[PDB]
Design an enzyme around this catalytic site. Structure first.
Site, PDB file in Angstrom:
ATOM      1  CB  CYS A   1     -30.983 -21.792 -53.102  1.00 16.58           C
ATOM      2  SG  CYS A   1     -31.087 -20.717 -51.609  1.00 16.58           S
TER       3      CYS A   1
ATOM      4  CG  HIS B   1     -26.989 -22.119 -50.955  1.00 14.62           C
ATOM      5  ND1 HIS B   1     -27.445 -21.430 -52.078  1.00 14.62           N
ATOM      6  CD2 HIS B   1     -26.497 -23.291 -51.415  1.00 14.62           C
ATOM      7  CE1 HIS B   1     -27.227 -22.165 -53.155  1.00 14.62           C
ATOM      8  NE2 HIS B   1     -26.654 -23.294 -52.780  1.00 14.62           N
TER       9      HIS B   1
ATOM     10  CG  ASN C   1     -25.012 -25.657 -55.019  1.00 17.84           C
ATOM     11  OD1 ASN C   1     -26.042 -25.248 -54.490  1.00 17.84           O
ATOM     12  ND2 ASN C   1     -23.906 -24.932 -55.077  1.00 17.84           N
TER      13      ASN C   1
ATOM     14  CD  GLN D   1     -29.494 -20.315 -56.684  1.00 18.86           C
ATOM     15  OE1 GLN D   1     -29.068 -21.297 -56.081  1.00 18.86           O
ATOM     16  NE2 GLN D   1     -30.074 -19.301 -56.071  1.00 18.86           N
TER      17      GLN D   1
HETATM   18  C1  LIG Z   1     -31.113 -19.003 -52.016  1.00 16.03           C
HETATM   19  O1  LIG Z   1     -30.895 -18.899 -53.210  1.00 16.03           O
HETATM   20  C2  LIG Z   1     -32.428 -18.651 -51.425  1.00 16.03           C
HETATM   21  N1  LIG Z   1     -32.141 -18.548 -50.037  1.00 16.03           N
HETATM   22  C3  LIG Z   1     -33.105 -18.951 -49.199  1.00 16.03           C
HETATM   23  O2  LIG Z   1     -34.168 -19.395 -49.634  1.00 16.03           O
HETATM   24  C4  LIG Z   1     -32.903 -18.862 -47.690  1.00 16.03           C
HETATM   25  C5  LIG Z   1     -33.321 -20.184 -47.044  1.00 16.03           C
HETATM   26  C6  LIG Z   1     -32.598 -20.697 -45.805  1.00 16.03           C
HETATM   27  C7  LIG Z   1     -33.535 -21.599 -45.068  1.00 16.03           C
HETATM   28  C8  LIG Z   1     -31.369 -21.448 -46.209  1.00 16.03           C
HETATM   29  N2  LIG Z   1     -33.754 -17.757 -47.249  1.00 16.03           N
HETATM   30  C9  LIG Z   1     -33.970 -17.459 -45.972  1.00 16.03           C
HETATM   31  O3  LIG Z   1     -33.460 -18.087 -45.051  1.00 16.03           O
HETATM   32  O4  LIG Z   1     -34.845 -16.367 -45.722  1.00 16.03           O
HETATM   33  C10 LIG Z   1     -35.809 -15.896 -46.690  1.00 16.03           C
HETATM   34  C11 LIG Z   1     -37.271 -15.756 -46.377  1.00 16.03           C
HETATM   35  C12 LIG Z   1     -37.903 -16.651 -45.525  1.00 16.03           C
HETATM   36  C13 LIG Z   1     -39.251 -16.504 -45.202  1.00 16.03           C
HETATM   37  C14 LIG Z   1     -39.977 -15.456 -45.734  1.00 16.03           C
HETATM   38  C15 LIG Z   1     -39.356 -14.554 -46.591  1.00 16.03           C
HETATM   39  C16 LIG Z   1     -38.009 -14.709 -46.908  1.00 16.03           C
HETATM   40  C17 LIG Z   1     -30.848 -18.052 -49.816  1.00 16.03           C
HETATM   41  C18 LIG Z   1     -30.287 -18.010 -51.213  1.00 16.03           C
HETATM   42  N3  LIG Z   1     -28.939 -18.221 -51.377  1.00 16.03           N
HETATM   43  C19 LIG Z   1     -27.979 -17.347 -51.102  1.00 16.03           C
HETATM   44  O5  LIG Z   1     -28.198 -16.220 -50.656  1.00 16.03           O
HETATM   45  C20 LIG Z   1     -26.564 -17.811 -51.405  1.00 16.03           C
HETATM   46  C21 LIG Z   1     -25.601 -17.324 -50.331  1.00 16.03           C
HETATM   47  C22 LIG Z   1     -24.170 -17.834 -50.411  1.00 16.03           C
HETATM   48  C23 LIG Z   1     -23.390 -17.179 -51.544  1.00 16.03           C
HETATM   49  C24 LIG Z   1     -23.535 -17.523 -49.103  1.00 16.03           C
HETATM   50  N4  LIG Z   1     -26.190 -17.323 -52.727  1.00 16.03           N
HETATM   51  C25 LIG Z   1     -26.395 -18.045 -53.820  1.00 16.03           C
HETATM   52  O6  LIG Z   1     -26.904 -19.174 -53.782  1.00 16.03           O
HETATM   53  O7  LIG Z   1     -26.004 -17.419 -55.037  1.00 16.03           O
HETATM   54  C26 LIG Z   1     -24.717 -17.274 -55.677  1.00 16.03           C
HETATM   55  C27 LIG Z   1     -24.570 -17.784 -57.097  1.00 16.03           C
HETATM   56  C28 LIG Z   1     -25.563 -17.556 -58.047  1.00 16.03           C
HETATM   57  C29 LIG Z   1     -25.422 -18.032 -59.368  1.00 16.03           C
HETATM   58  C30 LIG Z   1     -24.280 -18.737 -59.745  1.00 16.03           C
HETATM   59  C31 LIG Z   1     -23.287 -18.970 -58.809  1.00 16.03           C
HETATM   60  C32 LIG Z   1     -23.436 -18.491 -57.487  1.00 16.03           C
END
Ligand SMILES: *[C@@]1(=O)[C]N(C(=O)[C]([C][C]([C])[C])[N]C(=O)O[C]C2=[C][C]=[C][C]=[C]2)[C][C]1[N]C(=O)[C]([C][C]([C])[C])[N]C(=O)O[C]C1=[C][C]=[C][C]=[C]1
Length: 215
Positions: free
Chosen positions: A25, A162, A182, A19
């Site tokens: 994600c 996530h 992942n 990503q």
């Molecule tokens: C992910 O990438 C996108 N995320 C979501 O889609 C979440 C979904 C949950 C159901 C799990 N969004 C959400 O809940 O609300 C958004 C929304 C909903 C409705 C309308 C508008 C908006 C979360 C994202 N992932 C992350 O934030 C994670 C967090 C963790 C580090 C704790 N980070 C991540 O994946 O990136 C780090 C990384 C990036 C590149 C290489 C290595 C690590």
């Protein structure tokens, strides 16, 4: 029912994407679900487009996150989702530029699984295949995972942050685990995968936000 299951050794799982600096994600979670379905539907394993989802799902926030269900429903109302070929991943949000001629598949709705119920989830994986599941991956033990069935008592079951993909379930040295695909790159965890804990009281909140698409 089955004890072990792995849709990897069944050709239902595509290569591990990455990503980048985009909170997509969800897009990657949804796509991987459809991918496993397609392979079962037609026998064809092609990379679907997270970007078509990022740009085109008005209900979701693009790189700011989204829900897999909205992404599934979109593929239904729009009768189709493009392939990576027809819609490469730029890893950035842009206006919707979906191409009908690139369409690789679609879906007729989704099924959600009872919250917290890992047995239902295990049954889902055994019958259907890769299911989209949301988990709490904030814990730095997760970010430094490398080998073994992950488990950390800090993990918050209600801190879903996530979206990831469930490509199986099994056991290891007494530990019944889940096999998770992942979207952080082939160089994260074990070749882009994590063997999270299973049964262990809904560890990390894995069974609270899972859903698969109907094809
Ligand atoms: C992910 O990438 C996108 N995320 C979501 O889609 C979440 C979904 C949950 C159901 C799990 N969004 C959400 O809940 O609300 C958004 C929304 C909903 C409705 C309308 C508008 C908006 C979360 C994202 N992932 C992350 O934030 C994670 C967090 C963790 C580090 C704790 N980070 C991540 O994946 O990136 C780090 C990384 C990036 C590149 C290489 C290595 C690590």
């Amino acid at each position: 029912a089955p004890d072990s299951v792995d849709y990897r050794k069944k050709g239902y799982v595509t290569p591990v994407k990455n990503q980048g600096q985009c909170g997509s994600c969800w897009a990657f979670s949804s796509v991987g679900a459809l991918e496993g379905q397609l392979k079962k539907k037609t026998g064809k394993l092609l990379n679907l487009s997270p970007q078509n989802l990022v740009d085109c799902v008005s209900e979701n926030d693009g790189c700011g996150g989204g829900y897999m269900t909205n992404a599934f429903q979109y593929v239904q109302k729009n009768r189709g989702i493009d392939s990576e070929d027809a819609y490469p991943y730029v890893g950035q949000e842009e206006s919707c530029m979906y191409n009908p001629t690139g369409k690789a598949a679609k879906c007729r709705g989704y099924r959600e699984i009872p919250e917290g119920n890992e047995k239902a989830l295990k049954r889902a994986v055994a019958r259907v295949g890769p299911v989209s599941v949301a988990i709490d991956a904030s814990l730095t033990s997760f970010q430094f995972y490398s080998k073994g069935v992950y488990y950390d008592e800090s993990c918050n079951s209600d801190n879903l942050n996530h979206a990831v993909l469930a490509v199986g379930y099994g056991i290891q040295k007494g530990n019944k685990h889940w096999i998770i695909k992942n979207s952080w790159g082939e160089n994260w965890g074990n070749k882009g995968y994590i063997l999270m804990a299973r049964n262990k009281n809904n560890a990390c909140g894995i069974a609270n936000l899972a859903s698969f698409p109907k094809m």
